[PDB]
């Protein structure tokens, strides 16, 4: 029944964090010890959450952007009563534990997104805040405040130095995300040592200039009243995102506090013993949480638990007065798609750019899938991600119900924000940009793959087809890179029908991110295209019995393969295989793959990209050998030898070299 003082709670946190890192013989004790005071106040007095229900949809979201200090989050999750035991803590950074080196979504209860790569968390948080603001504007009604929570995000010096972070904070300021509260742990230390070695900005002046309401707590090591007031002011102030700048001593309490030595290595048994004694704690007991400290957390959680119950009742009344909205709310938060959407997608007609084919799909999808939310990185009129017929409204501080986000020229932040939007629940996010600049955001793309986020990237201008912009704008090696990436779908549709198929696949992939590679130039529609085919990854668009050659292609090059096949009609019986998504094809059973790419039959692949990686399917490739050039698309295709005649010549030589079932077996056949 006795309640520990806020200081006792803070010191308990500091020590548990230290023991966690020590037990793992690896980790970062520094930051966790420095942010303990703020965490104590935040987790036992301010933040709204239920440790018995991590899935409560109206809970405040918490994100630790400086993921290396996750020992702190694990300690807090345990003390608060989440399903994370002392055994989990003792398994820190060890094989198969629920407590890996950096926060991982799904691995640990209470962790919203996976961080570690600096700057990502901050951008994820911006996405989490955008989601709350948009859903509140969409579902809230007079007398029914069913969506109302804050987004709290910890970050360090490392985070602020990263461009992805600067991009996100910039957009957050512009969007005036008032419920976003960034807690910046300023302790003047990084791996190299003092921050003055490479980072000396007037942060307060800087973030105010970016539209942030900055609140300083000069002594974040012991000023509990300051910490309390800072959070209260942050919640009270409106119209701007907040940034609480607390000045703290990294590794506070340790003999090596305030130095880079406590950044990423265990403090050691002796130093830990002195730290405990210094705080008046037993220097002999490890992983020891006082029962009166647990009582403080329990009292807080009981209050929030009551809030949830009260919230559940409100949603019940809400659902009664608004049957339809209630059903939608429940449906969106589950990520369910209104039925009948796929059948509404467009099919081939006139020759158009798959870029336009994507727009035609969004013209149908926006109205059919209210959860859909997306935008472009200042390439709206180029990516064609905002169909006029959809009558879209831009998301802004003055129109939070808007569904189109103007990301500005911020590819990296855009992709990281998409992860945040997905992590929230109730949103199906997509973002557009030129395929070549997805390279600017591979840091976020990788995390979408690791965290199993359903995010969609509308990547237009996918090749030399771009034309005049030149080599710096023409991808030739990026698709290969994305294809090497685990759990990532890279779909390159050939026409309207395959494009609708691509969106269908992207939308139904609940745990896999998808890159839609779209062309700038028109492509000729194929009569053999189908959504069912796209779902299989690869399939025949042109078949013939007892085939002597297979020509596999994707996107804008399928027409070349088809024409090449015609030109070879009299000589060879050629099958043309459209392969929009290699990841889906590889996942098909052996019998299906054997039926598409029969062993022993020579295969020629055609794609305006480098050949790297194609050896797993073809015996010869007609594509790029280097970077592009500045000239009209048509000129570039002839220039680089990516033509029908070249395909015909290559197919002819292959058939000649490997006649009747003698084509070299590929690794997949005997693997």
Ligand X SMILES: Cc1ncc(C[n+]2csc(CCOP(=O)(O)OP(=O)(O)O)c2C)c(N)n1
According to CB under 5 A, which residues from 403 to 432 bind Ca ion? Answer: none
Q: Which residue of 148, 223, 342, 378 would you call a contact of ligand X, by CB under 6 A? A: 378
Asked if residue 2 belongs to a known ligand binding site, the reply is no
DSSP class per residue in 464-485: GGG-TT-GGG--SSHHHHHHHS
Residues 329-347, buried b or exposed e (16+ Cβ, 10 A)? beebbeeebeeebbeebbe
- CA geometry: angle 39, 291, 20, nearest 5 deg: 55
CA pair distance 65, 153, nearest whole angstrom? 6
Provide the minimum distance between the beta carbon of 395 and a copy of itself in the complex, in angstroms, as a whole number: 10
Asked if residue 158 belongs to a known ligand binding site, the reply is yes
User: Which of the listed partners (Ca ion, ligand X, a copy of itself, none) does 394 bind, with a CB threshold of 5 to 8 Å by partner kind?
Assistant: a copy of itself
Nearest to 21 by CA among 275, 290, 279, 280: 275
The tokens for 231 are 């959070």
Asked if residue 61 belongs to a known ligand binding site, the reply is no
Residues 583-614, buried b or exposed e (16+ Cβ, 10 A)? bbbeebeeeebeebbeeebbbbbbbbbbbebb
According to CB under 8 A, which residues from 31 to 70 bind a copy of itself? Answer: 67
Binding mask 84-123 for a copy of itself (x = CB under 8 A): ---------xxxxx--xxx-x---------xxxxxx----
Nearer to a copy of itself, 296 or 485 (CB): 485
Residue 108 backbone zone (phi > 0: left; psi -120 to 50: alpha; other: beta): beta
Which residue of the set 178, 411, 498, 646 is catalytic? 411
Asked if residue 547 belongs to a known ligand binding site, the reply is no
User: Which of the listed partners (ligand X, a copy of itself, Ca ion, none) does 470 bind, with a CB threshold of 5 to 8 Å by partner kind?
Assistant: a copy of itself
| Contact (CB, 8 A) for 444 and 415 | yes
Provide the minimum distance between the beta carbon of 157 and a copy of itself in the complex, in angstroms, as a whole number: 8
Nearer to a copy of itself, 24 or 32 (CB): 24
Active site residue 201: no
According to CB under 6 A, which residues from 63 to 122 bind ligand X? Answer: 66, 68-69, 116-118
Binding mask 249-288 for ligand X (x = CB under 6 A): -x------------x-------------------------
Farthest CA pair distance, the chain: 92
Count the residues of the shown chain that bind Ca ion, applying the rule CB under 5 A: 4
CA pair distance 428, 646, nearest whole angstrom? 42
Asked if residue 157 belongs to a known ligand binding site, the reply is yes
187 is a site residue for Ca ion (CB under 5 A): yes
DSSP annotation of 251: T
Nearer to a copy of itself, 6 or 413 (CB): 413
The tokens for 622 are 């007609």
Spatial CB neighbours of 388, under 8 Å, sequence gap ≥ 6: none
Q: Which residue of 351, 409, 484, 595 would you call a contact of ligand X, by CB under 6 A? A: 409
Q: Which residue of 174, 235, 535, 573 would you call a contact of a copy of itself, by CB under 8 A? A: 174
Asked if residue 437 belongs to a known ligand binding site, the reply is yes
Which residues precede gaps in the chain, with C-N > 2.5 A? Answer: none
Asked if residue 473 belongs to a known ligand binding site, the reply is yes
Nearest to 211 by CA among 233, 178, 244: 178
156 is a site residue for Ca ion (CB under 5 A): yes
Provide the minimum distance between the beta carbon of 102 and a copy of itself in the complex, in angstroms, as a whole number: 5
User: Which of the listed partners (Ca ion, ligand X, a copy of itself, none) does 66 bind, with a CB threshold of 5 to 8 Å by partner kind?
Assistant: ligand X
Give me the residues that bind ligand X (CB under 6 A), please: 28, 30-31, 66, 68-69, 116-118, 156-159, 187, 189-191, 250, 263, 378-379, 409, 437, 440
The set of catalytic residues is 411
Annotated binding site for Ca(2+): 157, 187, 189
């Amino acid at each position: 029944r006795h309640m520990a003082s806020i200081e006792k709670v803070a010191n308990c946190i500091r020590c548990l964090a230290a023991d966690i890192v020590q037990g793992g013989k690896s980790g970062h004790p520094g930051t966790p010890m420095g942010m303990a005071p703020m965490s104590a106040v935040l987790w036992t007095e301010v933040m709204k959450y239920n440790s018995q229900d991590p899935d409560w949809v109206d809970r405040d979201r918490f994100v630790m952007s400086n993921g290396h200090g996750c020992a702190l989050q694990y300690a807090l999750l345990h003390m608060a009563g989440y399903n994370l035991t002392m055994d989990d803590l003792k398994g820190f950074r060890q094989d198969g534990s629920r407590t890996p080196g950096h926060p991982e979504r799904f691995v640990t209860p209470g962790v919203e997104v996976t961080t570690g790569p600096l700057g990502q968390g901050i951008a994820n948080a911006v996405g989490l805040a955008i989601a709350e603001a948009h859903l509140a504007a969409t579902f809230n009604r007079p007398g029914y405040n069913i969506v109302d929570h804050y987004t709290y995000v910890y970050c360090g010096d490392g985070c602020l130095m990263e461009g992805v972070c600067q991009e996100a904070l910039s957009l957050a300021g512009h969007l005036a995300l008032e419920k976003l509260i960034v807690i910046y742990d300023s302790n003047y230390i990084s791996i190299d040592g003092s921050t003055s070695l490479s980072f000396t900005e007037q942060c307060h002046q800087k973030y105010v200039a970016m539209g942030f309401h900055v609140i300083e707590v000069k002594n974040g090591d012991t000023d509990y009243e300051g910490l309390r007031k800072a959070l209260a002011e942050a919640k009270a102030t409106k119209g701007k995102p907040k940034m609480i700048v607390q000045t703290t001593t990294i590794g506070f309490g340790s003999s090596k506090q305030g130095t880079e030595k406590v950044h990423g290595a265990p403090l050691g048994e002796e130093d830990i013993a002195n730290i405990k004694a210094k705080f008046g704690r037993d220097p002999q007991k490890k992983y020891d949480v006082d029962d009166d400290v647990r009582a403080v957390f329990r009292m807080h959680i009981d209050k929030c638990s009551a809030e949830q119950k009260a919230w559940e009742e409100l949603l019940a009344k809400y659902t009664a007065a608004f049957p339809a909205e209630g059903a939608a709310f429940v449906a969106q938060m589950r990520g369910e798609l209104p039925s009948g959407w796929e059948a509404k997608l467009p099919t081939n007609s006139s020759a158009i750019a798959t870029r336009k084919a994507s727009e035609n799909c969004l013209a149908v999808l926006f109205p059919a899938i209210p959860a859909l939310m997306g935008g472009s990185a200042d390439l709206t009129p180029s990516n064609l991600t905002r169909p006029a017929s959809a009558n879209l409204v831009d998301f802004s501080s003055s129109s939070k119900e808007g569904r189109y986000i103007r990301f500005g020229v911020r590819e990296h932040a855009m992709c990281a924000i998409l992860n945040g939007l997905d992590a929230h629940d109730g949103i199906i996010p997509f973002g557009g940009t030129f395929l070549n600049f997805i390279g600017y955001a591979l840091g976020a793309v990788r995390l979408a793959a690791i965290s199993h986020h359903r995010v969609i990237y509308v990547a237009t201008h996918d090749s030399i087809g771009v034309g005049e912009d030149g080599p710096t704008h023409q991808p030739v090696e990026l698709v290969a890179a994305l294809r090497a990436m685990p759990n990532l779908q890279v779909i390159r549709p050939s026409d309207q029908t395959e494009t609708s198929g691509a969106w269908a696949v992207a939308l139904s992939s609940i745990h896999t991110p998808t890159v839609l590679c779209l062309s700038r130039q028109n492509t000729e529609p194929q009569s053999g295209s189908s959504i069912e085919g796209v779902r299989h990854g690869a399939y025949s668009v042109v078949d013939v019995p007892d085939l002597q050659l297979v020509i596999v292609a994707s996107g804008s090059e399928v027409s070349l393969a088809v024409d090449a096949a015609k030109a070879l009609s009299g000589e060879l019986r050629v099958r043309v295989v459209s392969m929009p998504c290699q990841e889906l094809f590889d996942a098909q059973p052996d019998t299906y793959r054997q039926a598409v790419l029969p062993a022993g039959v020579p295969v020629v692949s055609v794609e305006a990209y480098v050949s790297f990686g194609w050896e797993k399917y073809s015996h010869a490739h007609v594509g790029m050998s280097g970077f592009g050039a500045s000239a009209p698309a048509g000129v570039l295709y002839k220039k680089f030898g990516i033509t029908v005649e070249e395909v015909v010549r290559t197919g002819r030589e292959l058939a000649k070299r490997f006649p009747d079932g003698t084509a070299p077996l590929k690794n997949s056949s005997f693997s």
